[PDB]
Amino acid sequence: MVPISPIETVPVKLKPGMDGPKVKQWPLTEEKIKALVEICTEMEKEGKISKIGPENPYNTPVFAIKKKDSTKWRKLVDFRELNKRTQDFWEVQLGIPHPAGLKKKKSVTVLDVGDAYFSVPLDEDFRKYTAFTIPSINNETPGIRYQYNVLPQGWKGSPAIFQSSMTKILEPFAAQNPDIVIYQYMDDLYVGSDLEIGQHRTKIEELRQHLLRWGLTTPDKKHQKEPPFLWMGYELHPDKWTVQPIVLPEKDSWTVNDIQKLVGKLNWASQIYPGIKVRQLSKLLRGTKALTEVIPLTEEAELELAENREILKEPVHGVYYDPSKDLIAEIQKQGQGQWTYQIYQEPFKNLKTGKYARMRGAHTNDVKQLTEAVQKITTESIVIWGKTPKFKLPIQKETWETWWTEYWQATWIPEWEFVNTPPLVKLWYQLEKEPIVGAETFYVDGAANRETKLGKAGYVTNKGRQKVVPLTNTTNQKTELQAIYLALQDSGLEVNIVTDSQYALGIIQAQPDKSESELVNQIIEQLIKKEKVYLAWVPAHKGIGGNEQVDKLVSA
Amino acid sequence: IETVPVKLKPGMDGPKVKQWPLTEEKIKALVEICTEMEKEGKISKIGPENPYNTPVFAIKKKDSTKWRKLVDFRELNKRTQDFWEVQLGIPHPAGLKKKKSVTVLDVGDAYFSVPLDEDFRKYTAFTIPSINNETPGIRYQYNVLPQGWKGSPAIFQSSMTKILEPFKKQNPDIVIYQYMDDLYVGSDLEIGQHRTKIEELRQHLLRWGLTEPPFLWMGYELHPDKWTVQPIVLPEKDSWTVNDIQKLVGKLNWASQIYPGIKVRQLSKLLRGTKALTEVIPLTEEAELELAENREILKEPVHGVYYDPSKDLIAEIQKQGQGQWTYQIYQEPFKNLKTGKYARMRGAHTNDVKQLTEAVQKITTESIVIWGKTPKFKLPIQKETWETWWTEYWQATWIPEWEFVNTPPLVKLWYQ
Ligand SMILES: Cc1cc(/C=C/C#N)cc(C)c1Oc1nc(Nc2ccc(C#N)c(F)c2)nc2ccsc12
Ligand SMILES: [Mg+2]
């Protein structure tokens, strides 16, 4: 006997105030009972479970499931109730590595750690809550009562306790072999290195020797799995990676469900396939969530899908991360609030790709959206590579400096350089800081009756120009915008505009270049056409003539 | 040497806040710092039975060259009991803001000499994350009073009063205030002697420390007696255009929400007709009289303005351009307790967010000196831009609360 170190036990509690499960054992056929008795006898010899006396008051149902195309039965203990009352744990696999942050490896081995999983003991004070009962033959004897001594399959805490136990065992081996990497996933350890294959597997046997300390055995006949690996949706290769094949179905009619898989596949493919777009295909699902409803695909959505089919026509591969080189991120505008990007270190060899979609709002502009895309790529890059990439952006240095120095909010984007690949982001209008000399001055106002919805909008100017337009199905806020629209329509290339609408100011001072409101969009297109516009605000009902005059004209 | 029992507020569990992503250099800085702390017994590895978490990152204090561990205990502080068992609450020294020099000391390392209640330690769990999740996060919990936790200065106050008792009796004119990891030491002496009156303190707690603090050497010096305010000022002109008078009336109308007798009809009556914005308008004497009376009103304090310690302080900030920022602290709208202005945004000529980040810390520092607590900020910035970058320029050991303003206020014009 070679002594083996015990595996440190994790103390487990139930949720505060909760007691263990007390669920009644379903009746079973005599055939299933004999099956479970033989299965549980083997596990008792293996030490996985132990018979208990009648004093234990807890119970969890056990089932026998007939396997497909076999004469053998499997055992299933249903820990759904116990899981509801087991304390929360620290789960470690919430974050999973992205292949673009991995490093190139010459050799990668896979070792099965499934028998090692059962050397992890369950907290002795907690085992009583895992009790289950095999029903007896003809219900004429007391049922056989067992409790688990090891982490039960399907129990809430088994994944977290298992990997945290393996990590503790593997830590000194990894720390004293910094020329290999070890990563655990499910029942498998992955060991990679850049060593010549000779030394690489001495290290593998050194890992099996280290695992023997705790009596953990790995299969001698080496694993059947080898590069490439099919892992969490990717294809991992020695020096490149890709998502698993993306196949878009052919359909003459698409349902609500049919589009959510298509967008799902497109979202997954967008991390390496450049330029994937999902706007017109996601729009077809807004509001409605009727799994069966068929949706006519707009010719916009048909074009977007056809554009995606052309991009997905072949495998596209990305490379792994080289910490000795810079990260470069490059963004393009796609239209309709869509942005696509590539992240690379050497030209034409992307590490990964991605996309960003405009947030939902009443108004927006391209500079705000590009800024948000930069922040998303920045955070993703901190996640994946632990650094911010240098950016190449479709915006001139002069446009950005004009934007951030005049914008009312604080804003910043990290180190970047202009790349001249249209469509470029630009500023479409710039309001003046001081009133314009020689330009006609427009005093605008509008009002509406909150019951009849009837309103008026118009202006009066210093040259005697006047207009009042009667309106139907409108509001006070809409008439205040229409009045500004009229003054822009009827003025020359330079104009001063005086309004009392705090609502209109707040919109225009946000500097949008596109809006959900077709009236704001019309104002924007008038602003683009002007050379100089000074927009001044005065308070309402305060004796300010021009304002007061048109106030009476529109509120009559 | 004895642990004081600490528990959370009734019906509340420990914090479960996600660690945000960290750069490589902060991760490695935290590994070095936490490895030594584990050797010195300050922290200990924890297993998966601990589900709680509090975010951690690393900073560099103002002109320091080595990283400092900073834990965002804002959620744990909200969930921790409030300490009134020994003291009903230290009455905030109103005389601290009147001293001509106030030095801020990082006495946070002193809290590591006091053990933490063993039943409460699970709630201080934090995670050093890994890049790309290529290894499990390094999980720790605290065995001693942690820096940044509101219960650390409350428990250690037992000790702290006894450490500086020789100093307080030797120097009865020096005002000493403790907020979190900070010690605010105020005096009216001469500048040269002020340092002299700082190191002496410093040498004390290093003498109690050897019976070395990695940041006790430094002093952040202020002068709250020369803290300037911002009353409401109206222009003084010889030629008023229509635009000037419209801006003036708009400003006086906003001030009328704050002041009682503001009046604008004589000034508004000059704006009779439909005149060009750049046309010069002579003032009637009724208008100048009205302007003169409004000017006198704006030189008096605001009526009914009092600080209530039971209510939150609120700080608004406006970007004014050219590196200038205005701010107002209040508890109810139009009842400003302090207003100010900063053109002193250091090393950030090309960075709006660094400027805003230094202004936030500047306003918080003033708020601690005056009222002994931090305000909730209304920041003129998008949530996504601020949360991406503020930790890069943070140099204080506390962290306030903040919300975000997405609609441009008209009020920027009135403090411009
Ligand atoms: C070794 C391994 C295996 C897997 C197994 C997946 C499955 N099915 C997963 C991870 C995350 C793995 O971990 C890593 N891998 C890589 N580099 C890499 C390079 C080439 C190949 C190939 N061929 C590869 F597999 C991985 N770098 C790092 C750096 C820190 S840990 C890690
Ligand atoms: Mg009106």
Side-chain angles (χ1 to χ4, degrees):
Chain A
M1 172 93 238
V2 182
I4 58 176
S5 310
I7 293 185
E8 172 178 314
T9 292
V10 170
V12 181
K13 292 189 208 162
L14 297 172
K15 293 180 179 174
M18 314 257 272
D19 193 21
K22 292 164 172 293
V23 185
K24 165 237 85 181
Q25 167 60 50
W26 291 55
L28 296 176
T29 68
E30 181 177 350
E31 186 183 7
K32 292 174 181 176
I33 291 177
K34 296 181 181 178
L36 290 172
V37 170
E38 193 170 30
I39 296 175
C40 290
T41 298
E42 295 298 317
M43 291 186 285
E44 182 183 4
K45 306 202 231 92
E46 294 171 330
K48 301 180 182 177
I49 54 182
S50 301
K51 316 227 288 187
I52 63 182
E55 44 278 60
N56 189 316
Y58 306 102
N59 197 69
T60 289
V62 61
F63 299 82
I65 45 159
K66 181 65 139 151
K67 172 138 198 173
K68 306 166 294 184
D69 285 17
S70 184
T71 184
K72 297 170 294 183
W73 307 76
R74 181 177 181 170
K75 156 177 111 331
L76 185 277
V77 187
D78 173 32
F79 284 114
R80 279 189 266 125
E81 187 64 28
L82 174 61
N83 292 336
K84 293 179 177 178
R85 300 131 174 252
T86 302
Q87 61 157 103
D88 289 337
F89 293 91
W90 187 250
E91 311 284 350
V92 291
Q93 45 285 329
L94 177 63
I96 173 148
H98 193 284
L102 297 175
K103 269 63 61 182
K104 66 154 191 33
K105 298 304 170 197
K106 269 190 54 58
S107 331
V108 175
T109 314
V110 187
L111 320 173
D112 184 44
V113 290
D115 297 330
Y117 164 96
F118 299 111
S119 300
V120 184
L122 180 56
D123 184 22
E124 164 217 9
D125 296 316
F126 195 82
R127 296 168 164 160
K128 56 180 180 178
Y129 306 116
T130 61
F132 61 99
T133 317
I134 297 181
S136 69
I137 299 288
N138 289 318
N139 311 311
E140 291 186 346
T141 53
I144 310 179
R145 295 272 292 164
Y146 284 104
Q147 79 181 10
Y148 273 89
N149 305 313
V150 302
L151 306 178
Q153 305 281 356
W155 178 57
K156 179 183 175 186
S158 295
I161 293 175
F162 175 51
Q163 186 173 355
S164 61
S165 305
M166 288 297 304
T167 292
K168 195 176 183 62
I169 283 160
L170 296 166
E171 251 171 36
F173 187 88
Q176 291 172 40
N177 294 275
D179 55 348
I180 71 170
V181 297
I182 307 175
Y183 173 82
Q184 186 186 340
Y185 169 73
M186 303 283 119
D187 206 24
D188 296 319
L189 288 178
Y190 301 99
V191 189
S193 70
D194 286 324
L195 304 167
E196 63 111 349
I197 175 179
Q199 321 187 29
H200 168 89
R201 341 171 78 163
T202 55
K203 297 264 187 172
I204 296 294
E205 290 304 311
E206 292 179 345
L207 173 60
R208 303 171 80 242
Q209 195 76 273
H210 172 89
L211 289 182
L212 273 184
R213 280 172 161 261
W214 294 266
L216 305 186
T217 55
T218 76
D220 258 315
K221 295 105 68 176
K222 297 312 293 293
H223 221 259
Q224 302 283 351
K225 294 310 210 304
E226 57 175 358
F229 316 98
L230 280 60
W231 168 77
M232 306 295 293
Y234 304 95
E235 289 189 8
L236 300 191
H237 301 252
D239 59 347
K240 62 178 188 297
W241 71 276
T242 300
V243 300
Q244 279 161 41
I246 309 288
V247 179
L248 304 184
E250 304 283 352
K251 305 225 182 187
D252 292 287
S253 58
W254 302 75
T255 76
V256 162
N257 174 241
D258 287 321
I259 308 173
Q260 80 191 157
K261 324 148 216 163
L262 184 69
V263 178
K265 285 187 179 63
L266 289 169
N267 285 336
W268 189 251
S270 58
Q271 64 186 319
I272 192 53
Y273 282 97
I276 293 298
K277 293 186 285 183
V278 293
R279 165 108 176 102
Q280 303 300 332
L281 289 172
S282 303
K283 281 176 66 282
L284 320 171
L285 309 182
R286 278 145 143 211
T288 309
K289 279 294 180 292
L291 65 167
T292 84
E293 180 176 345
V294 303
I295 273 69
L297 311 81
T298 55
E299 41 210 272
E300 300 81 300
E302 297 283 2
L303 183 51
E304 178 174 284
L305 168 59
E307 288 166 357
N308 288 326
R309 294 190 183 274
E310 187 61 35
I311 292 172
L312 293 173
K313 82 69 189 178
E314 81 293 1
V316 165
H317 60 285
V319 295
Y320 291 121
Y321 176 57
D322 186 352
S324 62
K325 308 201 194 74
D326 268 329
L327 278 174
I328 308 296
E330 198 167 339
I331 307 179
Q332 296 89 33
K333 177 187 181 183
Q334 293 185 302
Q336 297 80 62
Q338 295 170 107
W339 303 77
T340 188
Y341 63 88
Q342 307 82 47
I343 301 175
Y344 61 90
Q345 307 189 269
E346 301 272 310
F348 310 114
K349 286 176 157 295
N350 295 334
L351 276 60
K352 73 179 302 300
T353 69
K355 57 180 178 56
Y356 175 77
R358 171 187 65 203
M359 287 190 302
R360 272 311 112 170
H363 328 289
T364 187
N365 71 40
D366 283 347
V367 188
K368 295 184 190 184
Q369 290 173 30
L370 178 63
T371 304
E372 296 163 3
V374 166
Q375 312 297 352
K376 167 185 189 294
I377 297 167
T378 296
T379 300
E380 172 171 285
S381 296
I382 304 303
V383 172
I384 301 182
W385 303 286
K387 66 203 243 225
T388 305
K390 297 173 184 174
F391 282 95
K392 286 165 68 178
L393 305 178
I395 180 175
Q396 297 257 34
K397 284 281 170 175
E398 184 170 325
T399 299
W400 176 247
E401 168 140 286
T402 299
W403 163 259
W404 79 261
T405 52
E406 300 292 334
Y407 191 48
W408 73 274
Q409 284 190 337
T411 180
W412 157 263
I413 59 182
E415 172 177 343
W416 68 278
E417 71 189 50
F418 169 60
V419 55
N420 186 13
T421 66
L424 302 190
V425 175
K426 51 171 288 189
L427 295 172
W428 294 95
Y429 57 87
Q430 292 170 233
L431 305 181
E432 295 294 315
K433 304 175 182 180
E434 299 297 329
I436 309 157
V437 185
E440 193 173 5
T441 294
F442 282 66
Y443 294 81
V444 303
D445 193 8
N449 185 283
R450 189 146 60 82
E451 270 141 300
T452 60
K453 299 296 183 181
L454 297 170
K456 300 176 181 179
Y459 57 77
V460 298
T461 88
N462 65 307
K463 298 180 69 181
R465 193 193 317 269
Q466 297 190 15
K467 172 178 290 186
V468 179
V469 173
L471 300 167
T472 69
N473 192 40
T474 186
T475 58
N476 284 276
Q477 294 193 338
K478 178 174 277 219
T479 62
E480 292 167 354
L481 284 169
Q482 182 79 24
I484 297 179
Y485 179 53
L486 293 163
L488 291 170
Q489 272 187 314
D490 299 353
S491 53
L493 293 174
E494 308 187 353
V495 55
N496 299 303
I497 294 176
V498 172
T499 173
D500 63 35
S501 173
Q502 307 176 222
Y503 166 80
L505 264 301
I507 296 183
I508 299 182
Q509 287 186 334
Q511 299 188 59
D513 58 28
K514 234 174 180 181
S515 182
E516 283 185 342
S517 176
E518 156 218 296
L519 176 54
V520 183
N521 289 326
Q522 273 161 337
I523 291 172
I524 294 168
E525 175 203 38
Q526 286 292 321
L527 290 174
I528 296 171
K529 291 163 61 71
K530 297 293 188 180
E531 290 173 1
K532 289 186 177 182
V533 168
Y534 178 71
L535 184 54
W537 179 89
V538 301
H541 307 296
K542 282 302 177 182
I544 294 151
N547 174 264
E548 319 275 327
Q549 275 75 350
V550 71
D551 164 54
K552 303 206 64 58
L553 265 56
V554 305
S555 320
Chain B
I1 195 170
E2 253 309 311
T3 72
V4 163
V6 175
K7 296 187 298 188
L8 302 167
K9 288 213 254 287
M12 293 188 177
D13 203 355
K16 293 187 167 181
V17 189
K18 303 188 164 305
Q19 175 64 44
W20 57 70
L22 296 180
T23 62
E24 183 171 355
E25 60 174 345
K26 290 186 184 60
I27 290 176
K28 300 200 280 154
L30 287 171
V31 165
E32 299 176 17
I33 295 174
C34 289
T35 292
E36 295 305 281
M37 292 184 69
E38 182 186 0
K39 295 180 189 170
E40 301 171 356
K42 296 174 184 170
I43 55 180
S44 302
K45 297 282 178 65
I46 60 173
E49 73 277 18
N50 190 328
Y52 307 111
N53 196 70
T54 293
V56 61
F57 66 112
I59 63 176
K60 294 191 174 186
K61 215 308 168 189
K62 184 65 174 64
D63 271 272
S64 178
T65 190
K66 53 131 55 171
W67 294 95
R68 184 192 195 274
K69 180 176 185 284
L70 187 46
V71 189
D72 178 14
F73 279 124
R74 275 179 295 181
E75 185 69 24
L76 180 60
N77 290 333
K78 293 174 194 168
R79 294 166 180 264
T80 302
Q81 83 180 116
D82 309 283
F83 296 76
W84 328 111
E85 57 164 55
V86 179
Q87 303 86 359
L88 308 167
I90 42 171
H92 175 74
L96 166 60
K97 63 172 178 298
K98 312 180 200 173
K99 311 303 267 159
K100 301 164 77 216
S101 284
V102 174
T103 302
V104 191
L105 301 170
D106 185 14
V107 298
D109 179 88
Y111 303 160
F112 293 151
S113 67
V114 169
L116 177 65
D117 177 28
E118 300 168 16
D119 288 283
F120 199 80
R121 303 183 178 180
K122 71 191 72 169
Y123 303 137
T124 67
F126 62 93
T127 314
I128 304 181
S130 62
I131 300 179
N132 202 18
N133 307 133
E134 297 176 359
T135 299
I138 312 182
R139 295 271 292 161
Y140 290 104
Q141 82 189 0
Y142 270 93
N143 298 315
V144 296
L145 298 186
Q147 297 179 142
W149 179 52
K150 75 166 179 184
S152 297
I155 293 172
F156 193 78
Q157 153 178 230
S158 149
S159 321
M160 179 71 69
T161 299
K162 315 187 190 318
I163 290 109
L164 320 163
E165 210 75 288
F167 181 74
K168 292 147 91 179
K169 180 18 60 189
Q170 190 69 37
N171 306 269
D173 292 340
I174 301 200
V175 183
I176 311 180
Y177 176 65
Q178 189 183 202
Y179 183 80
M180 304 304 297
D181 307 341
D182 292 341
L183 200 63
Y184 297 82
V185 180
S187 43
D188 287 317
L189 82 186
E190 181 268 349
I191 305 124
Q193 341 280 310
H194 188 68
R195 299 56 174 163
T196 306
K197 298 309 291 189
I198 295 310
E199 14 178 29
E200 310 156 307
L201 268 65
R202 288 198 185 99
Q203 93 203 20
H204 284 51
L205 188 41
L206 177 63
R207 293 181 187 188
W208 317 79
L210 273 81
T211 80
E212 293 177 350
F215 292 104
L216 183 55
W217 74 74
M218 187 178 298
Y220 173 47
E221 59 176 85
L222 321 161
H223 304 288
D225 74 316
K226 194 34 77 178
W227 275 355
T228 308
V229 296
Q230 276 266 108
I232 310 181
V233 294
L234 310 175
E236 287 186 26
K237 299 177 174 294
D238 300 321
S239 313
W240 297 80
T241 67
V242 173
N243 183 67
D244 291 323
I245 301 176
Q246 291 180 350
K247 292 160 58 183
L248 175 64
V249 167
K251 189 167 178 176
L252 285 168
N253 179 72
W254 157 88
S256 66
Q257 297 174 289
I258 304 164
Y259 281 92
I262 294 302
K263 306 249 204 59
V264 298
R265 305 54 168 159
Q266 302 305 323
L267 286 157
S268 292
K269 148 184 197 188
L270 310 172
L271 298 174
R272 274 177 182 178
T274 308
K275 298 171 183 287
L277 279 194
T278 60
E279 176 171 323
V280 173
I281 305 306
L283 299 182
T284 68
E285 85 160 275
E286 304 88 328
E288 329 172 71
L289 182 61
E290 183 177 76
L291 177 55
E293 292 159 333
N294 294 328
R295 227 184 272 274
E296 285 290 291
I297 291 177
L298 294 174
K299 303 203 291 193
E300 305 179 351
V302 175
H303 287 341
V305 170
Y306 65 102
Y307 169 67
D308 183 357
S310 74
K311 293 188 289 195
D312 294 339
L313 291 163
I314 299 164
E316 290 186 12
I317 301 178
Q318 299 86 32
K319 171 180 173 184
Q320 296 287 356
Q322 304 184 48
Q324 310 188 30
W325 305 77
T326 49
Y327 68 93
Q328 309 80 40
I329 308 178
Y330 62 90
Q331 295 181 307
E332 294 146 33
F334 310 108
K335 299 294 180 185
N336 285 337
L337 300 167
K338 189 185 191 306
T339 72
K341 179 185 171 183
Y342 295 144
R344 184 49 276 166
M345 295 300 99
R346 140 195 60 93
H349 176 223
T350 198
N351 192 329
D352 262 349
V353 179
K354 183 172 179 176
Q355 300 184 43
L356 180 58
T357 306
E358 294 167 352
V360 169
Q361 297 174 82
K362 272 179 136 333
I363 299 168
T364 303
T365 293
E366 297 177 6
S367 298
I368 292 168
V369 176
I370 301 171
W371 305 280
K373 71 184 187 183
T374 71
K376 173 148 196 176
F377 287 82
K378 303 175 75 176
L379 300 176
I381 190 178
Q382 292 299 108
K383 172 187 180 183
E384 291 72 23
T385 302
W386 174 261
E387 295 298 340
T388 301
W389 296 112
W390 69 262
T391 60
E392 289 288 332
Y393 321 108
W394 201 257
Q395 301 188 300
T397 61
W398 31 251
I399 310 177
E401 308 287 336
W402 44 62
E403 59 193 54
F404 307 99
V405 184
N406 310 117
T407 301
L410 271 174
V411 79
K412 182 183 78 173
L413 310 174
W414 318 139
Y415 294 106
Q416 181 189 8

